[PDB]
Design a binder for these strands. Structure first.
Ligand SMILES: [Mg+2]
Ligand SMILES: [Mg+2]
Lengths: 129, 150, 97, 81, 184
RNA sequence: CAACGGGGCCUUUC
């Protein structure tokens, strides 16, 4: 069964991006999906995304701009400390200058840079670069 | 899907986006509730009540017209069955299979199907006992299954 | 089906179970239908049919034995014959034959 | 392809698609007012009716259930609600 | 008048609305049993970019189906009584804040009292005569969201000229940008 | 003065 709708959405985005599509449909478009997409869009890896409101969990159409190499979830959502953020970024990101390890923290879903400049930690959610 | 099969069928109802009664629907919610109670008194399960409502009348969904589900209306009116309808039908099918198996006793396919049906009954009864729809000591016993479906 | 109609009668209407109460209801004339099990002894069956002929009461012959008739009326004991006094909200008395 | 409006598909494509696979899923069934040979009501009948719907004030069969859409007894006037 | 319809402390603007309700019920013995129970509370005036203003009339939610079934007729008369005004009827729905982790427990905060539910019902009340046939949410690259409401093309000729007024009223009430579209 | 982070008030809400 569906266990991680965020994983399904990020997999769909990755497949569309690597096949060259400028847009992608993801279902069922949870709040975590929306916040992850908002972080990605803030850092410029995706364009506009629209939430289609069926009276089910909903859908999302994302516009891809060709700047995304890979977005993916880290399952399970490992508990990450302030000192473990560095290890996670070293393991997941291609360079120390760009790319983002996304965490869910009590201060919200944010990239590792925002997490470390707010001095917060939480559970790892995924990555984008 | 198909908990006890390899089928991947996706056939189901596609209920409308509109959550309000259709513009052409002119019957009252009180009249729909009265008809629901009449059907329940005539001995119809909530699914049969909804089928007759949608076929013979203009009520698309008793939830979108009366503001409540059919089983909820029946429980509020004091016509809630002793055990839930789907569990009742599962136990009825198990009784039928067990009777056919007593008569035949060479039907190994029926033995396998009976195992599947009773597993489904036990899972449903576990859920109902968890949500306290059934008593915590409620049990499906094959020797009294017919006595519990009637 | 017949078992569903009988279940509706047990749930809502009035009934008696057993030969003695069935015959008493027949003789008082407050019986609208008597259902006789398949395995009823033929002498008892004939006596019930004669009482029904005298009281102008309908007779239905249940295809099962007393075990099956007791199950159909929802009891844990054998019932050889059922008498319907009031149908309640049940279509058993009109949708027969 | 590689660029298309998933948010604004053509009505032809949406009608072609399966009822659950549209952008927002919804039923393709409908309701019908069937005029009885009598009067006092025009009976509302589901398109894919599973019940052989009878007249409210008569005893005639309006529709017969089938695999999909029900039949309509071959004498009937019906309007699609 | 100002006692059977006011329902709150007096405000000068409610006087005209109460008088235009009582006179319309006086002038209609075929409609003299509908407006009698129909009271309301404080009306809010909302600016509109087109120089006009909108009157949001609040009824918390008793007999809002009555206001609905008689609304397609008296809305236009309340518009005629004084022009440059778009009249809309809204239910006054309580919002209970989502409880915090350390907050004292209260009783379960019904789903109708959530901020999302009351805003969706606000949209329905705003476009009452026309059913909402879809909703979309554009998440702009800048970071803000715009909610698009797709309306039924049937009977849209009674609200279509006040769509901008609807947008202004919703922005004033919720603070979220809304845009209407009729799918043709 | 720009960014980055904090706190308090309304906005139907402490
Ligand atoms: Mg499937
Ligand atoms: Mg399995």
């Amino acid at each position: 069964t569906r266990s991680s709708v965020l994983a399904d959405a990020l997999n769909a985005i990755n497949n569309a991006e690597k096949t060259g599509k400028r847009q992608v449909l993801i279902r069922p478009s949870s709040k975590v999906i929306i916040k992850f997409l908002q972080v990605m869009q803030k850092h410029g890896y995706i364009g506009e995304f629209e939430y289609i409101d069926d009276h089910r969990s909903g859908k999302i159409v994302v516009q891809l701009n060709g700047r995304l190499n890979k977005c993916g979830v880290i399952s399970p959502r490992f508990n990450v400390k302030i000192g473990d953020i560095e290890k996670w970024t070293a393991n997941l990101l291609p360079a120390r200058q760009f790319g983002y390890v996304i965490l869910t923290t009590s201060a919200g879903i944010m990239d590792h840079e925002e997490a470390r400049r707010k001095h917060v930690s939480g559970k790892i959610l995924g990555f984008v670069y | 899907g198909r908990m006890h099969s390899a089928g991947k069928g996706i056939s189901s109802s596609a209920i409308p986006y509109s959550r309000n009664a259709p513009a052409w629907f002119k019957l009252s919610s009180e009249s729909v509730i009265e008809q629901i109670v009449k059907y329940a008194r005539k001995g119809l399960t909530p699914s049969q009540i909804g089928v007759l409502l949608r076929d013979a009348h203009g009520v698309t969904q008793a939830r979108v017209i009366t503001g409540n589900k059919i089983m909820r209306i029946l429980k509020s009116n004091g016509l809630a069955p002793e055990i839930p309808e789907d569990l009742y039908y599962l136990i009825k099918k198990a009784v039928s299979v067990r009777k056919h198996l007593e008569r035949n006793r060479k039907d190994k396919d029926a033995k396998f199907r009976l195992i599947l049906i009773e597993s489904r009954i036990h899972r449903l009864a576990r859920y109902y006992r968890t949500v306290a729809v059934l008593p915590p000591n409620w049990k499906y016993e094959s020797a009294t299954a017919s006595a519990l479906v009637n | 089906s017949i078992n569903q109609k009988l279940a509706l009668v047990i749930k809502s209407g009035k009934y008696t179970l057993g030969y003695k109460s069935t015959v008493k209801s027949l003789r008082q004339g407050k019986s609208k239908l008597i259902i006789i099990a398949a395995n009823t002894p033929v002498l008892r069956k004939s006596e019930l049919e004669y009482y029904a002929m005298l009281s102008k009461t309908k007779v239905y012959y249940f295809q099962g034995g007393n075990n099956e008739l007791g199950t159909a009326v929802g009891k844990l004991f054998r019932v050889g014959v059922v008498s319907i006094l009031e149908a309640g909200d049940s279509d058993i008395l009109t949708t027969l034959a | 392809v590689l660029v298309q409006d998933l948010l604004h598909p053509t009505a032809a494509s949406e009608a072609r698609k399966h009822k659950l696979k549209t952008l927002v899923q919804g039923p393709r069934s409908y309701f019908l007012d069937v005029k009885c040979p009598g009067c006092l009501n025009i009976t509302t009948v589901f398109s894919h009716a599973q019940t052989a719907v009878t007249c409210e004030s008569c005893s005639t069969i309006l529709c017969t259930p089938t695999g999909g859409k029900a039949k309509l007894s071959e004498g009937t006037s019906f309007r699609r609600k | 008048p100002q006692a059977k319809i006011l329902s709150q402390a007096p405000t000068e603007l409610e006087l005209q609305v109460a008088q235009a309700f009582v006179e319309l019920e006086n002038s209609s013995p075929e409609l003299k049993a509908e407006l009698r129970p129909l009271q309301f509370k404080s009306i809010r005036e909302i600016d509109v970019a087109g120089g006009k203003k909108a009157l949001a009339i609040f009824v918390p939610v008793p007999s809002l189906a009555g206001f609905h079934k008689v609304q397609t007729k008296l809305t236009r008369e309340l518009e005629k009584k004084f022009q440059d005004r778009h009249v809309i009827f809204l239910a006054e729905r309580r919002i209970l804040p989502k409880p915090s982790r350390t907050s004292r427990q209260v009783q379960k905060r019904p789903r109708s009292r959530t901020l999302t539910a009351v805003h969706d019902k606000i949209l329905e009340d705003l476009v009452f005569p026309t059913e909402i046939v879809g909703k979309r949410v554009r998440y702009l690259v800048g970071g803000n969201k715009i909610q698009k409401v797709l309306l039924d093309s049937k009977d849209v000729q009674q609200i279509d000229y006040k769509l901008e007024s609807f947008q202004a009223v919703y922005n004033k009430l919720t603070g979220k940008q809304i845009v209407f579209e009729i799918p043709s």
